Amino acid sequence: MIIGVPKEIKNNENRVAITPAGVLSFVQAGHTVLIEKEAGVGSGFNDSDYARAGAQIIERAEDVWAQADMVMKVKEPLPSEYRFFRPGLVLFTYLHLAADPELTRVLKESGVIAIAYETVQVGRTLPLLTPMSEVAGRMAAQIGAQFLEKPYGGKGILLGGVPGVARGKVVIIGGGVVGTNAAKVAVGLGADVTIIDLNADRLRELDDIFGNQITTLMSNPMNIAEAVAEADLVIGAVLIPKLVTEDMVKAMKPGSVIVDVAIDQGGIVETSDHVTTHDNPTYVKHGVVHYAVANMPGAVPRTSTIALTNVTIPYALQIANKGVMQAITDNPALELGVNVANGEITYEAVARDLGYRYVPAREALG
Amino acid sequence: MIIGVPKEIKNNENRVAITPAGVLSFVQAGHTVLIEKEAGVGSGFNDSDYARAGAQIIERAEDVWAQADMVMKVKEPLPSEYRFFRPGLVLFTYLHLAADPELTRVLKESGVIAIAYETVQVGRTLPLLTPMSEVAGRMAAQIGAQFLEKPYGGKGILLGGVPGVARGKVVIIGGGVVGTNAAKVAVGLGADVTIIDLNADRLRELDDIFGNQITTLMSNPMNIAEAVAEADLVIGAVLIPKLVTEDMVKAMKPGSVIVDVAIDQGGIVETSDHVTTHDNPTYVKHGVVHYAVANMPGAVPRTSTIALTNVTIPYALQIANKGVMQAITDNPALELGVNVANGEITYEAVARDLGYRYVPAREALG
Amino acid sequence: MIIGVPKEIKNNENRVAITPAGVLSFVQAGHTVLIEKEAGVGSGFNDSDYARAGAQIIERAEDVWAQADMVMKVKEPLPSEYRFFRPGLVLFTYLHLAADPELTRVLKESGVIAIAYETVQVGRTLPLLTPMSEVAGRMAAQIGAQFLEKPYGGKGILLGGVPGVARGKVVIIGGGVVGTNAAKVAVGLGADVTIIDLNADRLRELDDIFGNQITTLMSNPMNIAEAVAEADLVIGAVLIPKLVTEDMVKAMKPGSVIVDVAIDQGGIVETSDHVTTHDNPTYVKHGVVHYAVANMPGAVPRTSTIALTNVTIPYALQIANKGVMQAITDNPALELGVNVANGEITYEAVARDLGYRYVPAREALG
Amino acid sequence: MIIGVPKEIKNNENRVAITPAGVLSFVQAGHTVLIEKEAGVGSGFNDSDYARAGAQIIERAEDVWAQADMVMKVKEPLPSEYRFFRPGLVLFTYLHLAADPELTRVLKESGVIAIAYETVQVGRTLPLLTPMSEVAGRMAAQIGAQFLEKPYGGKGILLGGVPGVARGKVVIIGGGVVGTNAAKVAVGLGADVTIIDLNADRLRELDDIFGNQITTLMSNPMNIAEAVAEADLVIGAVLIPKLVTEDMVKAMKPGSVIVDVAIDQGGIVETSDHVTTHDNPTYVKHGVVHYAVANMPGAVPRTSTIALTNVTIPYALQIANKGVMQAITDNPALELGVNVANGEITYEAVARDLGYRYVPAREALG
Ligand SMILES: NC(=O)c1ccc[n+]([C@@H]2O[C@H](COP(=O)([O-])OP(=O)(O)OC[C@H]3O[C@@H](n4cnc5c(N)ncnc54)[C@H](O)[C@@H]3O)[C@@H](O)[C@H]2O)c1
Ligand SMILES: NC(=O)c1ccc[n+]([C@@H]2O[C@H](COP(=O)([O-])OP(=O)(O)OC[C@H]3O[C@@H](n4cnc5c(N)ncnc54)[C@H](O)[C@@H]3O)[C@@H](O)[C@H]2O)c1
Ligand SMILES: NC(=O)c1ccc[n+]([C@@H]2O[C@H](COP(=O)([O-])OP(=O)(O)OC[C@H]3O[C@@H](n4cnc5c(N)ncnc54)[C@H](O)[C@@H]3O)[C@@H](O)[C@H]2O)c1
Ligand SMILES: NC(=O)c1ccc[n+]([C@@H]2O[C@H](COP(=O)([O-])OP(=O)(O)OC[C@H]3O[C@@H](n4cnc5c(N)ncnc54)[C@H](O)[C@@H]3O)[C@@H](O)[C@H]2O)c1
């Protein structure tokens, strides 16, 4: 198979859907990899690095997509890329089709086999989304610390204090992948950290991981109100009626900070109702700084690329070795990735949400 | 030399001034040790244990004191023991002579060489008092936890909480030997622990020992007021105008507990103005339980005996090998131990406080 | 729905089946909550706290039970409360019906829908019993430390020793919820801690949680005999022929302590054959102190109330929102809670043990 | 005595030379404190907070300086404040007189008793500079992490990586107060941290503090070259020929970051030859981002104020209680603070460096 990785073109997107490590996995298993010029550079991988791993460097986006059996990306194709679609092309990337009626329609009618990173799933987890959740949680505590600096609108404290000075209070809401990764960094900055979760077994697991390094708190509206009022930094760690209400935010001390990782989806914090750009990253409501930039992992493209590609490529490699049909037969997790194939919407919830007829991927590809 | 160790006779005193380990140190260096029957039993050392180490077991208190060159004890001789004094007798024990005008007078006029554990001193520390300070601090957090149990008058919490439940707040005032030993146990019980100290370098040392396991807080009246109000347990760790005022105690939550280790000396907590017995161990003022039992180390006599004897006997052994005069010549720390010799008060502060003429121990023994 | 929470009336029962946090969960979801006067006070929640959360404060027990659709408690109704039963009343509390033939008969014939906290079950665990197991294990190490104090009959040591003095040996038998919670506190007190378990995978899990902070030991009679003989404190952490025999206890050092958490059920320690009250808390057999007070969590009512209510109320809230029938249809864990409904014994093992006809709760409620 | 604390007027200076805690120390000891409006607000202390502690709030800078015996500040008086000087006025603040020939001349000829925080000294340490060193080191690792984000010019990594991804390399040069505080935060962010120091005993002390959490490396030019080349982040932790050479920086990987805490004094990094403002915070040389903003502690004014005032006020309080002459007689550390009194330069190194006659402070004040 021939695999192609164009440079990401969305604004300030510095990640890339393969690394030299990925190229070498494909080349060792008999395959050919094409990389557009400067694809890796935002993630500090140069054309020479990809070439040394055994890839061909391709001048023009167009020739990568045209010469490849499968294109891998990080983001969704933009309209400027619809031109490169073709029947039987495999596209492997983050798609978010349920919220992109238009992209779905063009993929469907262009004959694309479109595989979504975010719907590959083993049990209750999505293994190709986990890496960005992890990165996101690590980032949240770091960004929280930055916006607690007076120059960025914060009340001007260190989470760790210094000897003889009290520590900052970090309240994390949600103790899964995002929250657990945030708690590691917030404990490392020297904060008093409290992790709030609905699920008492998850709190027991966190008590076995963290011990005395944190406080675990059952999630209910009084526990959240009381915790958030005392908090220097609140981290909304629940990606999925709002858990932190305007009245709760109103009770917070001026110059406190709120980082809500689900800001793109509305958030769990009522006051965090809108997103913002890198150049205008916060707004203040009731004296409280709200960090509104989405795609935190986007701020550490090199970590985010390696974490993503560490888990995407072993899936991509099944497709290269076996072709899509055998790969999704052999691997039910990959099967749930196929959103579009051969004229049909092949993922139930996308079909339902947008009004097409669910057609199973295996059936669709016959 | 012949060394004698009577059984302690003060009420419920279970410690003892030597262990088999001590006996064996003396016997190996040429000496004879006498132990009264049941001397060690409150500390779980039996006559057979002392005998196996090479000691003689003596039926009657009187014969131990009469046959011995030096008697070692833990407490001060009671009036019931003045009868056993004699000129040239060495007594090595805890004396507290500055606060016992009467005992001092009888020791002076009986011709006793009286050596106080608590005035042996190297630099700024008293090495034969350190062990009871350590034991005391370890005990304070344990006793604090007990009196936070509802049956003992406390509000009924675990310092550690359980998963999903907040931890208790322990505020320790004083970050030296007592406080540092208390913080180890309070952190181990799972409390949020704050250590308050005047000395910013000591707070830096505690931050290097404990890291993120505690909060260090500079000592001033607002820091103490604010910390004590939030505290489930306050531990007064300063042995030396009161640091915790009635108004501060009044702001505390009902069922909170105060353990003040200097209760014998007045305390640093205004409300803790009196001491109490094991059978009536607390009183409540403003809803706050005050643990009033003195001699905490007395509750763990076996640990307290071993910790004491580990450091008293190497000093006692210099006296056995060299006689008092050479021992105090060779060892200035031991010299400062001699409070009474040969008619004179040989420790300045005792002479001053009680109105006798300071006479140096070396001069006094000539 | 109207929910009522009387004050617990068993002797010295200071817990309570709801907190302001619970009240607010019910009020936000459309419900009415009634609280009898002084219900929360043993757990340090006042009528004003419940009122501020949106509850009505009710003068007389009788009016709470009469005006409520569902009564929540901690303990079983006493005979003095049979008067308040009525057909169609929901009672949610700890029942222990298999061991209370009489209570079961009155609940059956009074027409009560009786739901037992202790038989709600997900897989192999009982989620509404877990919190008291956790509290119990945390308490066991603390009580162990207390009874090792000479005034309480112990040999007079600190588990942690002090510098230059050996640590105490804690042997915990059973490495599940109770034992794991005890090991956290015993390690925190500075003990040498050994955890004995039958299940080598649980020992591997404990080695990953605790590392070098403990010794894991396979459970067999020689490992237990040898461990218990060396132990200052033994904690029986197995709730379910006796694992510690009289001969094993006989080999222990005088002034050692045994806390057996299953004392109510006979225990795993042969010598611990009877229970005792707070005022007479131990007996000595073969020189070994046996702590015989049951209901350890009862000594920290405030922690125990919050830990219980953190998990009981989300179940109670399904009943309030959906009524018993829909709640147990939708939630098999809650279903296994229903012990008595509408004339029938609706929990197999209660029916079998007491000689009634098992009738499924859904069938029974038709 | 009357103490006055004006609002700091240097650009973006948000610290303040007293807190309510400080006010209360002064008021309890008989003194009067004046605070200008909005003095504390950059540090989140409001006029109401100072008033509640017992201070008078003063409308105009001028009236604070005129009515006060002693003015306390954080920064040096600006020219705009020379007007408020007067003979016999005590000024207590950070002065840096050796590098301010002009300020020194005006203080001398205005008759000011000028006491420098930064020359109070006990042994080899300056206790009123320690707090900003601590804050500075804590900040350096946090700022380092920020500038490793791609949007701030960095190569785009997390220091901690995520599971399956390598950690970032932090190299700290200097293992004293600044470096040790940086290492705590860099270890907490999950970096591989190496601390370089000349002094092998300091490396032994760091190995006892940190254990396996760091690598200690002896300082020599090859160790530094090799460490810096492998480093994602270098922190210059030496306040005092350059330790990191342009050739060493040239060998670093593009998008690496250098935070040199002595940037104000020239730095230990050759490439870091100039300082920059908050709005233009870095420059790139040889692909390496150089953070050039000075006064890091200035970014966390509230922590910095509390850490400073925790140690300045106990010195200020000796002056209030005893007057300058007795205070500096009784306290040699404070004595070395007096830089200017009563016409003379009273600190040797200032006199020498600027060409005046050293006159001892006690002599000068006669
Ligand atoms: N698309 C999704 O959001 C989704 C759904 C299921 C699982 N996942 C998996 O988890 C990752 C996403 O990270 P995540 O940390 O947000 O999810 P997660 O499942 O790892 O954790 C979410 C946590 O939030 C807790 N929670 C839910 N409601 C809460 C409330 N009201 N109050 C407090 N806590 C509450 C849950 O108990 C859980 O522990 C993905 O990488 C995937 O592996 C994703
Ligand atoms: N007899 C004494 O009380 C005495 C005096 C000097 C040293 N020591 C040594 O210390 C042991 C006694 O233990 P200790 O822990 O009480 O003494 P310690 O000297 O070890 O510690 C006392 C601590 O209290 C702090 N402190 C003092 N005033 C304070 C205040 N107002 N607010 C907050 N902190 C304050 C000090 O800075 C110090 O760190 C003895 O074993 C001996 O070695 C004894
Ligand atoms: N009613 C019960 O006793 C019961 C039964 C099943 C599970 N549970 C769950 O566990 C909690 C009760 O706590 P727990 O810690 O007693 O139970 P647990 O299941 O958490 O742990 C008991 C432990 O004892 C060990 N064990 C059993 N026999 C042993 C032996 N002979 N020697 C040594 N170890 C032995 C088991 O391997 C297990 O690890 C409840 O909260 C519930 O969640 C309860
Ligand atoms: N004004 C000063 O710079 C100064 C001088 C002496 C002490 N101090 C004290 O220290 C604080 C200042 O912080 P700091 O951390 O910079 O000083 P510090 O004295 O705490 O530490 C500096 C460290 O740098 C190390 N070092 C020196 N030359 C080195 C080299 N070539 N390579 C590697 N390591 C080297 C030293 O061994 C020392 O451990 C002040 O708060 C004060 O307490 C200040």
DSSP structure string for B185-225: HHHHTT-EEEEEES-HHHHHHHHHHHGGGSEEEE--HHHHH
**Three-state SS at C37:** coil
Q: Do chains A and D touch (3 or more CB pairs under 8 A)?
A: yes
**Ramachandran area for residue C342 (φ above 0: left; ψ -120 to 50: alpha; else beta):** left
Q: Is A211 on the interface with C (CB under 8 A)?
A: yes
B-proximal residues of C, 136-155, CB under 8 Å: 138-139, 142, 145-146, 148-151, 155
Q: What is the dihedral of CA B248, B250, B255, B260, to 10 degrees?
A: 40
The 10 Å CB-count burial string (b at 16+, else e) for A239-276 is beebbbbeebbeebeebbbbbbbbbeeebbbbbbbeee
SS3 C172: strand
Q: Which residue type does B93 have?
A: T
Facing residues of D90 across strands?
A: D70, D113
What's the alpha-carbon Rg for chain D, to the nearest Å?
Answer: 22
- Rounded to whole angstroms, the Cα distance separating D287 from D273 reads 16
DSSP label of D125: B
- B interface mutation test: which of A157, A187, A215 has the most B CBs within 10 A? A215
Tracing tokens 């004293």 back to the chain, one arrives at D176
B217 reaches A (C-beta below 8 A): yes
Counting ligands in written order, the one closest to the CA of A244 is 1
Query: Is residue B249 within 8 Å of residue B258, measured between CB atoms?
Result: yes
Q: Could you say which of A14, A138, A156 has the minimum Cβ distance to residue D301?
A: A156
- Pairing, β D70-72 against β D2-5: parallel
Give the closest of A200, A208, A221 to C209, CB-based: A208
D134 Cα to the center of ligand 4, angstroms: 12
CA of C238, closest atom in ligand 3: 16
Q: What are phi and psi of A193, to 5 degrees?
A: -110, 130
Task: Please answer whether residues B233 and B170 qualify as being in contact, where contact means their C-beta atoms are separated by less than 8 angstroms.
Answer: yes
Write out chain A residues lying below 8 Å of C131, CB-based.
200
Beta strands in chain B, from DSSP E residues, in sequence order:
2-5, 32-36, 56-58, 70-72, 90-93, 113-116, 169-173, 192-197, 215-218, 233-236, 257-260, 282-285, 288-291, 338-341, 344-345
Tell me the C-alpha distance between B171 and C320, whole Å. Answer: 42
**Is the minimum CB–CB distance between D311 and chain B shorter than 8 Å?**
yes
- C174: how many CB neighbours lie within 10 A of its CB? 27
β strands within chain A, DSSP E: 2-5, 32-36, 56-58, 70-72, 90-93, 113-116, 169-173, 192-197, 215-218, 233-236, 257-260, 282-285, 288-291, 338-341, 344-345
The helix (run of H) or strand (run of E) holding residue C71 is strand C70-72
Q: Is B131 helix (H, G, I), strand (E, B) or coil?
A: helix
Nearest to D118, CA basis, from D360, D283, D315:
D315
Residue D60 structure tokens: 């105009």
Q: What is the resolution of this structure in A?
A: 2.4
> Helix A177-188 vs helix A200-210: angle between axes, to the nearest 10 degrees?
30
Distances in Å between the Cα of A121 and the Cα atoms of A127, A314, A337, D162 are 6, 14, 8, 20
CA distance B364 to D105: 62
- List the determination method: X-ray
Count of alpha carbons within 13 angstroms of residue A118, beta-carbon side? 15
Q: Helix, strand or coil for residue D348?
A: helix
Pairing type for strands D32-36 and B282-285 reads: unpaired
Between vectors from CA A54 to CA A48 and to CA A58, what angle results, nearest 5°? 65
Spell out the alpha helix ranges (H) of C148-175. Answer: none
Catalytic hit among D47, D69, D96, D273: D96
Which one from B47, B69, B96, B353 is the annotated catalytic residue?
B96
Q: Which of residues 168-207 of B touch D (CB under 8 A)?
A: 198, 200-201, 204
Please tell me the distance between residue D267's alpha carbon and the centre of ligand 2 in angstroms.
Answer: 41
Query: 3-state DSSP helix/strand/coil percent for chain B, to nearest 5?
Result: 45, 20, 40
Q: Cα torsion at A120, A124, A127, A133 (round to 10°)?
A: 120
**Residue C204 burial by CB count (10 A; 0-12/13-18/19+): exposed, middle or buried?**
exposed
For the sheet with D338-341, list strands across it.
D56-58, D32-36, D2-5, D70-72, D90-93, D113-116, D338-341, D344-345
A133: nearest Cα among A315, A359, A295, A358:
A295
Residue C3 β-bridge partners: C33, C70
The number of beta carbons lying within 10 Å of the beta carbon of residue C53 is: 22
**Quick check: helix, strand or coil at residue C225?**
helix
For residue D161, the distance in angstroms to the closest alpha carbon of chain B comes to: 22
CA atoms within 13 A on the CB side of A261: 32
Quick check: D53 and B222 CB within 8 A? Answer: yes
Cβ-count burial of B51 within 10 angstroms (0-12 exposed, 13-18 middle, 19+ buried)?
middle
Question: Furthest-apart CA pair in chain C: how many Å?
Answer: 71
CA gap D16, B316 in Å, rounded: 57
C223 lines ligand 3 (CB under 6 A): no
* Short-list B303, B346, B273, B343, CA closest to B142: B303
What does the DSSP 8-state code read for residue D310? H
Residue appearing with tokens 């070498």: A24
The structure tokens 């492998």 sit at: D230
Chain-chain contact of A181 with D162 (C-beta, under 8 angstroms): yes
Structural contact between residues B318 and B330, judged by C-beta atoms closer than 8 angstroms: yes
DSSP letter assigned to residue C38: T
* C28 lies within 8 A of chain A by CB: yes
Contact residues, chain C, for B185 at CB < 8 Å: 160, 188-190
How far the first Cα of chain C sits from its last, in Å, is 20
CB-based contacts of D287, cutoff 8 Å, min separation 6: D252, D253, D254, D255, D256
In the sheet that holds A233-236, the strands lie side by side as: A215-218, A192-197, A169-173, A233-236, A257-260, A288-291, A282-285
Strand-by-strand arrangement of the C90-93 sheet: C56-58, C32-36, C2-5, C70-72, C90-93, C113-116, C338-341, C344-345
- Write down the domain spans for chain A: 1-128+301-366, 129-300
Burial class (CB in 10 A: 0-12, 13-18, 19+), C209: middle
Q: What is the DSSP string of D110-123?
A: HT-EEEEGGG--BT
Q: Which of A199, A208, A226 to mutate to test the interface with C (most CBs of C within 10 A)?
A: A208
Q: What angle do CA A28, A32, A34 make, to 5 degrees?
A: 125
Phi-psi region of D79 (alpha: psi -120 to 50; beta: other; left: phi over 0): alpha
Among the partner-chain residues A12, A135, A162, the one whose CB lies closest to the CB of D158 is: A135
Taking residue B141's Cβ as centre, other Cβ atoms within 10 Å add up to 28
Can you tell me the distance from the alpha carbon of A228 to that of A234, in angstroms, rounded to the nearest whole number? 7
Residues 6+ apart with CB under 8 A from A342: A111, A113, A364, A365
Residue D117: CB partners within 8 Å, gap ≥ 6?
A: D92, D93, D94, D95, D128, D129, D308, D312, D337
Ligand nearest to the CA of B244: 2
Helix (H, G, I), strand (E, B) or coil at C130: helix
Contacts of D348 (CB under 8 A, 6+ apart): D358
Residue C30, amino acid = G
How does DSSP classify residue C356?
Answer: -
C-alpha dihedral sign at C144, C149, C150, C152: negative
| Angle, CA of A181, A186 and A187, to the nearest 5° | 100
Cα C141 from Cα C156, distance rounded (Å): 15
B168: left (phi over 0), alpha (psi -120 to 50) or beta: beta
**How far apart are alpha carbons D51 and C197 in whole angstroms?**
62
Answer whether D185 sits within 8 Å of A190, measured CB to CB: yes
Amino acid at A305: T
Residues A59/A40, Cβ–Cβ less than 8 Å: no
